[PDB]
mmCIF file of C-alpha atoms and ligand atoms in Angstrom:
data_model
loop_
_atom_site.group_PDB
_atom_site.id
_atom_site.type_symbol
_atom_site.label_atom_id
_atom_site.label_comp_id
_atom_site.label_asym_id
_atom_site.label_seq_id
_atom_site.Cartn_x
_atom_site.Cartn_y
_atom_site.Cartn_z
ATOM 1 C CA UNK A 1 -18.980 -48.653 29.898
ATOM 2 C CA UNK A 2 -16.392 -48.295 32.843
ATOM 3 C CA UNK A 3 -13.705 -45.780 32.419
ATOM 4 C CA UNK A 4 -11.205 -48.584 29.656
ATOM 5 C CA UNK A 5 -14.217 -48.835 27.686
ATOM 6 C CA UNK A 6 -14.864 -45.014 27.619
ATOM 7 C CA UNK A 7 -11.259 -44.018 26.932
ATOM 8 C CA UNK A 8 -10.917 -46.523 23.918
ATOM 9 C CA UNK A 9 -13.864 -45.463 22.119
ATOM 10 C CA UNK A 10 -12.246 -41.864 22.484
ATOM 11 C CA UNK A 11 -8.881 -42.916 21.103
ATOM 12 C CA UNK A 12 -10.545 -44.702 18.147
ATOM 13 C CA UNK A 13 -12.609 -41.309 17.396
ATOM 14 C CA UNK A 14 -9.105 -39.844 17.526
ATOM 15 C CA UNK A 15 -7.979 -42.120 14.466
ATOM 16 C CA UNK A 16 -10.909 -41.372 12.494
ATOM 17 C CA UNK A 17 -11.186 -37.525 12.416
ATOM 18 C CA UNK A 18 -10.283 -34.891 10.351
ATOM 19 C CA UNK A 19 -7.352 -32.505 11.385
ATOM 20 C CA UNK A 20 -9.824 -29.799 11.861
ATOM 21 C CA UNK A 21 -12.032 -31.773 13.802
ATOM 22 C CA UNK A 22 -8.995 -32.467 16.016
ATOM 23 C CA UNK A 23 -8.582 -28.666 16.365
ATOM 24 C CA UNK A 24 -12.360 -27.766 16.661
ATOM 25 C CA UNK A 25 -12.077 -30.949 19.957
ATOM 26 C CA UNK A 26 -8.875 -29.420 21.505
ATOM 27 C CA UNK A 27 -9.434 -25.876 21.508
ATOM 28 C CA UNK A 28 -13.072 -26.465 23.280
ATOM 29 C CA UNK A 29 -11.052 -28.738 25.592
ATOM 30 C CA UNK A 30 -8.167 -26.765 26.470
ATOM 31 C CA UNK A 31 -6.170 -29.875 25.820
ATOM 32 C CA UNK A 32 -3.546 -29.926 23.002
ATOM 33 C CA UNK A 33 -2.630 -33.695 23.609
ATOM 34 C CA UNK A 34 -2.543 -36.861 22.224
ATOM 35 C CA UNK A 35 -5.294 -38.068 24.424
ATOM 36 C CA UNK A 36 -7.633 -34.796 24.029
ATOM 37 C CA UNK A 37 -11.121 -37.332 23.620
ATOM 38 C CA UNK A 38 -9.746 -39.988 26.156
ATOM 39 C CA UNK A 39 -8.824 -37.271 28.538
ATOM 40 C CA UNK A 40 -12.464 -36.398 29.118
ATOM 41 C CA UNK A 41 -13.967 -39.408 28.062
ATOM 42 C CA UNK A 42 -15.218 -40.604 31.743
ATOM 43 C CA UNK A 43 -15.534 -36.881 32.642
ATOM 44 C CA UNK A 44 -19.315 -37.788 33.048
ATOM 45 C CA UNK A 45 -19.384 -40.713 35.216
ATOM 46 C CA UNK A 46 -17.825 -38.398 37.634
ATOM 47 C CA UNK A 47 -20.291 -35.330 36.982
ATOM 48 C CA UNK A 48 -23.285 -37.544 37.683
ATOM 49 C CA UNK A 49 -22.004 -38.226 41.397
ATOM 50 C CA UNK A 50 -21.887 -34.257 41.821
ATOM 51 C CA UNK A 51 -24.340 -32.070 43.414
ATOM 52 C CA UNK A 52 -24.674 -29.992 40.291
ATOM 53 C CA UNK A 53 -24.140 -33.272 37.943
ATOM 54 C CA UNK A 54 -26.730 -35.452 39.505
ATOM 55 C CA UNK A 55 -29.655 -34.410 37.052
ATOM 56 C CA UNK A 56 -27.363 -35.891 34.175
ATOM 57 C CA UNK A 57 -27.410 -40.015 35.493
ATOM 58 C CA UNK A 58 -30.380 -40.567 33.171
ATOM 59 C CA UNK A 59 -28.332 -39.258 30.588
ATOM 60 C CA UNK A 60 -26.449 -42.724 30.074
ATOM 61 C CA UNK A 61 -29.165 -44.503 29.411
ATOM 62 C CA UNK A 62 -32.232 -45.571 27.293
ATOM 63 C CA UNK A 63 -34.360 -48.227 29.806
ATOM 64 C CA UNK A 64 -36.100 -49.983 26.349
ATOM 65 C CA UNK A 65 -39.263 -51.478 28.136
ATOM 66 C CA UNK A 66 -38.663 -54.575 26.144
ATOM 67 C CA UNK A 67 -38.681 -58.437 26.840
ATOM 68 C CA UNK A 68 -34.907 -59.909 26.478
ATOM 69 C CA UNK A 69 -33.905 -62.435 24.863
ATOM 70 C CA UNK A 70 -37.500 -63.758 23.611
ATOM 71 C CA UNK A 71 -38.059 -59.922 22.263
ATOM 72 C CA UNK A 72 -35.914 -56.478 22.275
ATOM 73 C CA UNK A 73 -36.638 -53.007 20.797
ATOM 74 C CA UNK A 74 -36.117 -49.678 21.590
ATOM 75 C CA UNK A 75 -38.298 -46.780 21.427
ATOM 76 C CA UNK A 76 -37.494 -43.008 21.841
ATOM 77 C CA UNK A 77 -41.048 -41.561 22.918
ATOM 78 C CA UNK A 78 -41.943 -44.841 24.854
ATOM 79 C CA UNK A 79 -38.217 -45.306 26.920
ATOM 80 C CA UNK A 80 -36.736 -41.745 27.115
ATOM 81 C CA UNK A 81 -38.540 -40.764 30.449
ATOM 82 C CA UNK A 82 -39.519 -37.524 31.791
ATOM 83 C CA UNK A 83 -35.773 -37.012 33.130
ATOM 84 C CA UNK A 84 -34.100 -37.473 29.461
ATOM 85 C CA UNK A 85 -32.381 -40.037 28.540
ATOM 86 C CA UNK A 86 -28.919 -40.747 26.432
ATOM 87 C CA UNK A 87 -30.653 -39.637 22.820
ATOM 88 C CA UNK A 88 -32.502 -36.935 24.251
ATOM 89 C CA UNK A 89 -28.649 -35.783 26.022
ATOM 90 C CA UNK A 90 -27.028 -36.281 22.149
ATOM 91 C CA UNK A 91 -30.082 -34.234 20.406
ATOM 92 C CA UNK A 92 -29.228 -31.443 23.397
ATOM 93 C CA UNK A 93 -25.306 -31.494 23.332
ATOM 94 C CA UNK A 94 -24.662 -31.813 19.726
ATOM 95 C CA UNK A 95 -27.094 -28.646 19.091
ATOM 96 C CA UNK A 96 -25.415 -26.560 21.651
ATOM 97 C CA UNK A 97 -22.237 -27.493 19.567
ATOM 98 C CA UNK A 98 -23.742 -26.716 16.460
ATOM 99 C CA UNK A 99 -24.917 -23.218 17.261
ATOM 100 C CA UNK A 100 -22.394 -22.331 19.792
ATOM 101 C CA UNK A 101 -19.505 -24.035 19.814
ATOM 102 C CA UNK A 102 -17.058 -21.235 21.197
ATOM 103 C CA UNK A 103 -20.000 -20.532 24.493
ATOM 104 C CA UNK A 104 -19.833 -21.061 27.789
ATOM 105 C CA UNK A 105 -22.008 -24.778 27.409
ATOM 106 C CA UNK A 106 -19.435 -26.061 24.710
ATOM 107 C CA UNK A 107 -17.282 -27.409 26.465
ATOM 108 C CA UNK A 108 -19.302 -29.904 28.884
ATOM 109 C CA UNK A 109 -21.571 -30.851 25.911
ATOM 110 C CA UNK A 110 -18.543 -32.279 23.955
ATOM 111 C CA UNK A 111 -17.716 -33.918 26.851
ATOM 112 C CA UNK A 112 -20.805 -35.288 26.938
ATOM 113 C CA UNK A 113 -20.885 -36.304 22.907
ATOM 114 C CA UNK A 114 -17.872 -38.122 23.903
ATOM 115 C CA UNK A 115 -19.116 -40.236 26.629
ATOM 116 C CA UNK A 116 -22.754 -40.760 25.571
ATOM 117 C CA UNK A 117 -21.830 -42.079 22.145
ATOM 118 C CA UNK A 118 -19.510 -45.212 23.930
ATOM 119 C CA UNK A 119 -22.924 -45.533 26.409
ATOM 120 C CA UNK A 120 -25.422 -45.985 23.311
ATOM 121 C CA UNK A 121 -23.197 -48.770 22.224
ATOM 122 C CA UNK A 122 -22.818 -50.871 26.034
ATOM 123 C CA UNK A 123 -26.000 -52.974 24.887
ATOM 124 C CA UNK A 124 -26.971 -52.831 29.041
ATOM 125 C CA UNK A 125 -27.173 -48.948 28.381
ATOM 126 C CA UNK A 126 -30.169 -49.514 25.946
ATOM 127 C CA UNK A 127 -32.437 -52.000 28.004
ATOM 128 C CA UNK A 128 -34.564 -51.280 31.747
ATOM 129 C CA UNK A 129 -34.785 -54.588 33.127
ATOM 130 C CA UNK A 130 -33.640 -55.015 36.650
ATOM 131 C CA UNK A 131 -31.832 -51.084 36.437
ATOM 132 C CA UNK A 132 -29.964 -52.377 32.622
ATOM 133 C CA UNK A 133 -29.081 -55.819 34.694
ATOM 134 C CA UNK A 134 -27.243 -53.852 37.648
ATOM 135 C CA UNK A 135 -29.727 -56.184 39.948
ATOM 136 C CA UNK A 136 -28.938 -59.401 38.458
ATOM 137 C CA UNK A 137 -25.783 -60.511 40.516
ATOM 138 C CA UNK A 138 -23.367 -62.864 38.986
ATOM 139 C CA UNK A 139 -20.227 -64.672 39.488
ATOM 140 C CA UNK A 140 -17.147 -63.757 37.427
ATOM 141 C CA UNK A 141 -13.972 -64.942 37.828
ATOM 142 C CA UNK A 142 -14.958 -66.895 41.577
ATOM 143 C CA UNK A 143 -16.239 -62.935 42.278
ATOM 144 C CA UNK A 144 -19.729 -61.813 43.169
ATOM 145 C CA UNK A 145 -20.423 -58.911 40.724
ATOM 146 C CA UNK A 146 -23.467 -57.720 38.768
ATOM 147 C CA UNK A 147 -24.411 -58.440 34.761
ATOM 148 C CA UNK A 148 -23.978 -54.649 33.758
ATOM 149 C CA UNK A 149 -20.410 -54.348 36.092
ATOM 150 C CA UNK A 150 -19.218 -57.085 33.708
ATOM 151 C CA UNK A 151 -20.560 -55.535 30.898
ATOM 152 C CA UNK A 152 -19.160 -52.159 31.359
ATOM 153 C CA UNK A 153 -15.771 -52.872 33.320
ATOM 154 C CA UNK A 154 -14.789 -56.994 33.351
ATOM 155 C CA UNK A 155 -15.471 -58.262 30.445
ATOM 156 C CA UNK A 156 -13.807 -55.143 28.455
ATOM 157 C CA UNK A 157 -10.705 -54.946 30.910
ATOM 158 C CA UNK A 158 -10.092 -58.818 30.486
ATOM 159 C CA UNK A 159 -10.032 -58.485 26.757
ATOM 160 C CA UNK A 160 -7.507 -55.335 26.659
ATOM 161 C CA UNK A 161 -5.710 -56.828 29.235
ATOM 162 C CA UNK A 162 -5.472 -53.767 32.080
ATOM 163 C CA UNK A 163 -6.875 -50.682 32.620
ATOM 164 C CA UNK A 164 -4.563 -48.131 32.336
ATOM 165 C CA UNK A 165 -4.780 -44.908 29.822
ATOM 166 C CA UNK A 166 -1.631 -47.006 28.071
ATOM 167 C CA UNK A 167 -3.934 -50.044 27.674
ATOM 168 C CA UNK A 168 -6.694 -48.676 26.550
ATOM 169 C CA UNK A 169 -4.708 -46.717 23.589
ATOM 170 C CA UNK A 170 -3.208 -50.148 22.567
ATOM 171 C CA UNK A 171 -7.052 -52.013 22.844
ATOM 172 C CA UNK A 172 -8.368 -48.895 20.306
ATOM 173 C CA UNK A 173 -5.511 -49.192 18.088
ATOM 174 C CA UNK A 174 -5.839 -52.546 17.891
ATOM 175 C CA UNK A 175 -9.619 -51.939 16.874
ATOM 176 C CA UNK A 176 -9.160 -49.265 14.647
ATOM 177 C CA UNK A 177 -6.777 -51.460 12.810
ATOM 178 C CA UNK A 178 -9.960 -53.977 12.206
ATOM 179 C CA UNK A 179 -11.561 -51.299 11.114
ATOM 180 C CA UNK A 180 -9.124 -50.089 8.872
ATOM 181 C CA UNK A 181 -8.047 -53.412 7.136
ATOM 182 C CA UNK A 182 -9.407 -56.539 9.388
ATOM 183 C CA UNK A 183 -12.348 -58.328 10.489
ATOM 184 C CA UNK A 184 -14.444 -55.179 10.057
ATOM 185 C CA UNK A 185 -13.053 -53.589 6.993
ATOM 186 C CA UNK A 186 -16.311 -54.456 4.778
ATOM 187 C CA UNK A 187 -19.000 -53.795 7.267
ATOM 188 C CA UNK A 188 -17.797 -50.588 8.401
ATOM 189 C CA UNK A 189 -18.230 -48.997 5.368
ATOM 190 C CA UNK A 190 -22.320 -49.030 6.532
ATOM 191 C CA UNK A 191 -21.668 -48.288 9.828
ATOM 192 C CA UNK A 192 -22.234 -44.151 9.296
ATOM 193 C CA UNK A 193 -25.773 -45.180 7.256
ATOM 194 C CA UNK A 194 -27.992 -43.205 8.604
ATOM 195 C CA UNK A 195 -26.202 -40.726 10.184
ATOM 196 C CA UNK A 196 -28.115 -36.935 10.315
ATOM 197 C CA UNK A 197 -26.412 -34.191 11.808
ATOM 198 C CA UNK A 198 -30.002 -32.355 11.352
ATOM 199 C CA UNK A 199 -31.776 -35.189 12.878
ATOM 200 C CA UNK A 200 -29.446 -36.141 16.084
ATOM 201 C CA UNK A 201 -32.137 -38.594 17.359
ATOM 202 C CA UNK A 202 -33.404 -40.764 14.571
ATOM 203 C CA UNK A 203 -29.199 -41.111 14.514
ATOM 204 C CA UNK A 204 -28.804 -41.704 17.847
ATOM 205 C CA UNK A 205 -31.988 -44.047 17.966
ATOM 206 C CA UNK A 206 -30.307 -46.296 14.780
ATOM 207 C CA UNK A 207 -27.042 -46.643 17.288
ATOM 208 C CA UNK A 208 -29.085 -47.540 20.247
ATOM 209 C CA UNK A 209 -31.414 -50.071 18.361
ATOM 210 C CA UNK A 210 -28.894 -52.103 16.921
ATOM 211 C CA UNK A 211 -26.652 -52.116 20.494
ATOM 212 C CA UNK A 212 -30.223 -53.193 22.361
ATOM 213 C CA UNK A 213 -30.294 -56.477 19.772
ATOM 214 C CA UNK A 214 -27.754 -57.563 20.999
ATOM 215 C CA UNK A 215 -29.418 -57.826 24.383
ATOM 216 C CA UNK A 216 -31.390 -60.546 23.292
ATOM 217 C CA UNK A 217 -28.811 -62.247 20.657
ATOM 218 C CA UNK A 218 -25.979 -61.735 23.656
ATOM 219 C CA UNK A 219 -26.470 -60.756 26.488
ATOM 220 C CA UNK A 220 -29.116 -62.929 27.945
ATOM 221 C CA UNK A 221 -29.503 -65.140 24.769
ATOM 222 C CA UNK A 222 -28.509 -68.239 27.423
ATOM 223 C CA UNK A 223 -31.293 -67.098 29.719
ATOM 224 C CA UNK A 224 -31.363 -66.125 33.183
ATOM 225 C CA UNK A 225 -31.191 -69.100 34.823
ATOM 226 C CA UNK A 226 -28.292 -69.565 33.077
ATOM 227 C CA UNK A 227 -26.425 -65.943 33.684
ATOM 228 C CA UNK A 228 -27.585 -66.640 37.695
ATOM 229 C CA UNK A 229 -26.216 -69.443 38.271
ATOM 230 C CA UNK A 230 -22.448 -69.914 36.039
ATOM 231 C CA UNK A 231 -19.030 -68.178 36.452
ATOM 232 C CA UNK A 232 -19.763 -65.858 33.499
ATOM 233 C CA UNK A 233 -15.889 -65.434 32.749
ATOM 234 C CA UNK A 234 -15.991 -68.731 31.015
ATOM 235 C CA UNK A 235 -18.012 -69.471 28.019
ATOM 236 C CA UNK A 236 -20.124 -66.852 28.291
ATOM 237 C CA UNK A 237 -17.207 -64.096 28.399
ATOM 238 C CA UNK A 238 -15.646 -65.807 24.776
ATOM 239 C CA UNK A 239 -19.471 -65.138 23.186
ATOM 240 C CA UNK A 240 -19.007 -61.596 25.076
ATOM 241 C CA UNK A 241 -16.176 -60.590 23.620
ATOM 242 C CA UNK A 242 -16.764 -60.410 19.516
ATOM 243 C CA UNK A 243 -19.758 -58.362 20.530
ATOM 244 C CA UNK A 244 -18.833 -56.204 22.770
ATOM 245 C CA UNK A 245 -15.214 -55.250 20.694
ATOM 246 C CA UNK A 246 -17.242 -54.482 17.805
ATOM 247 C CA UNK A 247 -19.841 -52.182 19.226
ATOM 248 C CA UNK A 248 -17.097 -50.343 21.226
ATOM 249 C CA UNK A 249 -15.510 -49.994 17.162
ATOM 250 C CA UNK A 250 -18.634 -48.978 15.834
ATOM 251 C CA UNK A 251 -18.942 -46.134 18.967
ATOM 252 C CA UNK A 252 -15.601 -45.103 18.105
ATOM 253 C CA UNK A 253 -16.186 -44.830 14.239
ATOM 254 C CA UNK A 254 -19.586 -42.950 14.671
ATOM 255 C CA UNK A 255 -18.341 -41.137 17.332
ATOM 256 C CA UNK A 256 -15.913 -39.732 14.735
ATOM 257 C CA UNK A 257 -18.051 -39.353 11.784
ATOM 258 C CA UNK A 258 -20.127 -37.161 14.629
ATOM 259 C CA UNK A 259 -17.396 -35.213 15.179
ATOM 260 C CA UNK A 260 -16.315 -34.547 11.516
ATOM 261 C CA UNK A 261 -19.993 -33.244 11.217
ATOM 262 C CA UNK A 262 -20.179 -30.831 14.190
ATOM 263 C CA UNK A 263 -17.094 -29.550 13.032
ATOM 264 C CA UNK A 264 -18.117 -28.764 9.781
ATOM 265 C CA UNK A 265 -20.561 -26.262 11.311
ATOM 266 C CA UNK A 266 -24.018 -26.767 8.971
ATOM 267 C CA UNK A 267 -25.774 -24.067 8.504
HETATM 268 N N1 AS B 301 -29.869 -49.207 31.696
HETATM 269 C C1 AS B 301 -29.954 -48.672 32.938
HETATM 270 N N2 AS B 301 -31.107 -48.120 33.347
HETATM 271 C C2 AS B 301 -31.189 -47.601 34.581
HETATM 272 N N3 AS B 301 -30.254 -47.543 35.530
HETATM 273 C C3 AS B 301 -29.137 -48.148 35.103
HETATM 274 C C4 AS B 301 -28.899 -48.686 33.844
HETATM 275 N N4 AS B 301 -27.637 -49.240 33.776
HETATM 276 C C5 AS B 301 -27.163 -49.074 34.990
HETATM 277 N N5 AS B 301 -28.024 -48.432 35.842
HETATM 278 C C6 AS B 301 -27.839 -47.979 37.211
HETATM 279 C C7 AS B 301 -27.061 -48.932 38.099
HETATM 280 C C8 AS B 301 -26.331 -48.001 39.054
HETATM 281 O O1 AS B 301 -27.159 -47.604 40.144
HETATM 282 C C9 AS B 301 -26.144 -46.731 38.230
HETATM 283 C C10 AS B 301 -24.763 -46.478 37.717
HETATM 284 O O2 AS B 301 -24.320 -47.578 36.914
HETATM 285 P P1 AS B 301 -22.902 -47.333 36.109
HETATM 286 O O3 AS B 301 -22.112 -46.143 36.672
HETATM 287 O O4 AS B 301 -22.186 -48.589 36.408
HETATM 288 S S1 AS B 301 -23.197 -46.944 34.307
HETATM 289 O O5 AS B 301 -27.072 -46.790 37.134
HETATM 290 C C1 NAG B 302 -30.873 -28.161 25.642
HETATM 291 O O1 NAG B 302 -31.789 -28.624 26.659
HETATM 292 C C2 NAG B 302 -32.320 -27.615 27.512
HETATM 293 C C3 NAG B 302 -33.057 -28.323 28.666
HETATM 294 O O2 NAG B 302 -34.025 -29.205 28.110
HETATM 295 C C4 NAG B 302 -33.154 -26.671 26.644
HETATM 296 O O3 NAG B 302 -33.621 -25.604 27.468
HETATM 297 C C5 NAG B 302 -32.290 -26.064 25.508
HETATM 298 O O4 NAG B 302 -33.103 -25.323 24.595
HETATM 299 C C6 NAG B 302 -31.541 -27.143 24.712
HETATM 300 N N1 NAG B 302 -30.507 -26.517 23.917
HETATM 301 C C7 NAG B 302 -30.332 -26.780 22.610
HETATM 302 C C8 NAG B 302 -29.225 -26.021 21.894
HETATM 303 O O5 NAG B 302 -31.066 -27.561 22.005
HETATM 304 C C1 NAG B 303 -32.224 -64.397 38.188
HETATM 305 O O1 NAG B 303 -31.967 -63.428 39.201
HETATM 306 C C2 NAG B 303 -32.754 -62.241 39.156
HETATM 307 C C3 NAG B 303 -32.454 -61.321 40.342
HETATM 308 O O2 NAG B 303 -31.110 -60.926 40.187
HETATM 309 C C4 NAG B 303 -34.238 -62.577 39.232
HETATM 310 O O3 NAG B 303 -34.977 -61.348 38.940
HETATM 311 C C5 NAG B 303 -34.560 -63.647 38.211
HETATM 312 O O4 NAG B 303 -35.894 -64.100 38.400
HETATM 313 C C6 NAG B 303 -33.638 -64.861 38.304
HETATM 314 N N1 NAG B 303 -34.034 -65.831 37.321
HETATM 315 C C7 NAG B 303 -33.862 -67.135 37.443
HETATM 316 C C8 NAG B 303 -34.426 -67.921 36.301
HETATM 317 O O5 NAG B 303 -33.254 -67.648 38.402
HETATM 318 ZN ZN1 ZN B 304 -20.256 -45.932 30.334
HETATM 319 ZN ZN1 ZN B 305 -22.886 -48.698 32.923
HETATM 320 ZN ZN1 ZN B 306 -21.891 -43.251 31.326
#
């Protein structure tokens, strides 16, 4: 996601955790706010522009060397890469946090937790082709752009309507509230299924294999000759939305439930 994306997926986390959790977060932060998570939420799109960052751009990512929309699927061994990948980062980060939470590393691994978690849910984030569809220009909105820019940034800043820190706190609590008692009230109650705080990447992989279906079911379900050649803010940006609002939910949600666990220091 773009920075609105990033930021409400932190602000939903913040609904969902437990007091101590919120504690654990801020005092590894340094930041006693209201906006701890959202704070540092983009923190790593900025890190991986940074001489010392730039090993960490893989780190968004899982390139699944699938076949969209005919066929998608998501590997860990096959897609990861030699350079690691976003599960690889969550098995890394969430370990340092687990076994030394108050060290030096603590504090840029929960700002990586943060971010990554929102990444593994942009469905873009979890497929190669053409660099996760950064080289398939499109037009949106009269505008040249590129399928993953709408993805992370248009699409997502259309629906909240802005992109401000304010905006992005009204967009989660507008989500959190489906969660809570709306459209995703039921389902969410399966959305932490899975989840392994000893086994950080068959967790991760579960989040990342159901954001990559919706590559094919989605994203490119019209086809390419479609997506090259139609103002995607149309049509294809009302399909968008439903999908892309719930898997920013369910980052938020798990993101939490991730949270609760690292705090809760396992043994
Ligand atoms: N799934 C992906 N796999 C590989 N590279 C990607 C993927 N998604 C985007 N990119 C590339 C496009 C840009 O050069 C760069 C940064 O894109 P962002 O910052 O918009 S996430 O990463
Ligand atoms: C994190 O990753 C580094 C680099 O791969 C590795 O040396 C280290 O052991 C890992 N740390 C944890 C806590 O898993
Ligand atoms: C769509 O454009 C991409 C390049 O952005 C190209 O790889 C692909 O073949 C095009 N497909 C069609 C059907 O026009
Ligand atoms: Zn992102
Ligand atoms: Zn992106
Ligand atoms: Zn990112």
């Amino acid at each position: 996601w773009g920075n609105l994306g990033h930021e409400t997926v932190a602000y939903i986390a913040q609904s969902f955790v437990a007091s101590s959790t919120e504690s654990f977060c801020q005092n590894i932060l340094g930041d006693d706010s209201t906006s701890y998570l959202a704070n540092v939420a983009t923190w790593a799109d900025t890190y991986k522009y940074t001489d010392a960052g730039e090993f960490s751009k893989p780190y968004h990512f899982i390139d699944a060397q699938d076949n969209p929309p005919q066929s998608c699927g998501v590997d860990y061994d096959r897609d990861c890469g030699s350079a690691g990948c976003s599960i690889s980062a969550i098995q890394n980060y969430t370990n340092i946090l687990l076994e030394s939470p108050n060290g030096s590393e603590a504090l840029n691994a929960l700002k990586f937790v943060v971010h990554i978690i929102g990444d593994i849910h942009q469905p873009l984030h979890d497929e190669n082709l053409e660099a996760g569809g950064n080289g398939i220009d499109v037009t949106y909105d009269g505008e040249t752009t590129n399928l993953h820019h709408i993805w992370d940034t248009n699409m997502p800043e259309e629906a909240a309507g802005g992109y401000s820190l304010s905006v992005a706190k009204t967009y989660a609590d507008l989500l959190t509230e489906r969660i809570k008692t709306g459209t995703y009230s039921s389902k969410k109650d399966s959305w932490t299924d899975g989840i392994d705080i000893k086994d950080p990447v068959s967790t991760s992989m579960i989040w990342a294999a159901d954001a990559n279906t919706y590559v094919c079911s989605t994203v490119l379900d019209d086809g390419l000759a479609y997506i090259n050649s139609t103002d995607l803010s149309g049509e294809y940006y009302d399909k968008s939305q439903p999908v892309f609002e719930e898997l920013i939910a369910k980052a938020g949600y798990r993101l939490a439930a991730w949270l609760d666990l690292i705090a809760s220091q396992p043994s």
